[PDB]
Amino acid sequence: KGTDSLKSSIEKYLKDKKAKVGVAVLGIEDNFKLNVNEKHHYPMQSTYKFHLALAVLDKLDKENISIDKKLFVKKSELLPNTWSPLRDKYPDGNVDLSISEILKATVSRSDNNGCDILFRFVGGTNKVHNFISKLGVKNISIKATEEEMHKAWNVQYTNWTTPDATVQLLKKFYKNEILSKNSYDYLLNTMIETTTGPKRLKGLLPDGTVVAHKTGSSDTNDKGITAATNDIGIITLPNGKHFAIAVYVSDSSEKSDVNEKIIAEICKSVWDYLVK
Ligand SMILES: [Cl-]
């Protein structure tokens, strides 16, 4: 009963789903906690852009560098054949772009080139990994850039996480325990402003529900396996309180609409329990 009933209900929902689904929920201002299939390592995909953002903002805070500081981005950096609004906008590259514009593209629109530019700025994947670990959150592995991930099929598996780790990280962020007030406000806004993943965490929630989130997606291999279909974030309840949730649908044989629906239904079931 109570939380246990919710977990069981979610478990029942997942029994006929041909995927490995991981779930974690953490209440922001209360003691609520939920975990389903927590132990497993789930591939992050674009969800890791959130962590990267924390690292860049943290670097800016420490070095007292403005978010308006411009970085010259070489043409070679704006790789083709990858999702990049930045490349589309600046096809010839060789342009000076503010960190703010780069961050916005990376977090709000999942820009791959933007993510790699930022990884360079903070010093590489290991630096981000260290930064996250040093925050007291274990079980998150960050080893590959977007460029690297676009090669072999199994590179994406090297960027992994447990669901609970994500939720712990989100809560710390949401409570403004990691960055400065200015940086926190900015990142949060970018997370709310996004139009990605409308059928995921947000899909069955009521119109007007504020959700700050970051999506993650993958390709489908020739055996019909979609490696990752993810959505992570902070949701605002009707009473004004919040909860962090992370859902990873991994190694799925299901159709793309089903994978999104799984995230949506699971979130909806959590929401209903929490509202009550
Ligand atoms: Cl923060």
**What's the CA gap between 150 and 159, in Å, rounded?**
13
Cβ atoms within 10 Å of 172's Cβ, excluding its own: 16
For helices 49-63 and 125-133, angle between their N-to-C axes, nearest 10 degrees: 80
Give the domain CATH number at 160: 3.40.710.10
Give resolution in angstroms.
2.2
- Nearest-angstrom CA–CA distance, 259 and 262: 5
Neighbours of ion ligand 1 (CB under 5 A): 173, 176, 178-179, 184
C-alpha span between 143 and 69 (Å, rounded)? 27
How many A from CA of 147 to the centre of ligand 1?
Answer: 28
Tokens of 276: 């009550």
Range of the domain at 131: 1-276
CA 101/CA 122 separation, integer angstroms: 16
> How many A from CA of 67 to the centre of ligand 1?
15
Backbone angles phi, psi at 35, to 5 degrees: -140, 135
Distance CA 202, CA 209 (A): 8
Q: How far is the CA of 254 from the centre of ligand 1 (A)?
A: 36
Domain count, the chain: 1
What residues are annotated to the active site?
A: 46, 146
Closest CA to 46 of 163, 196, 153: 196
3-class DSSP assignment, residue 255: coil
- Helix or strand holding residue 166 (H, E): helix 163-174
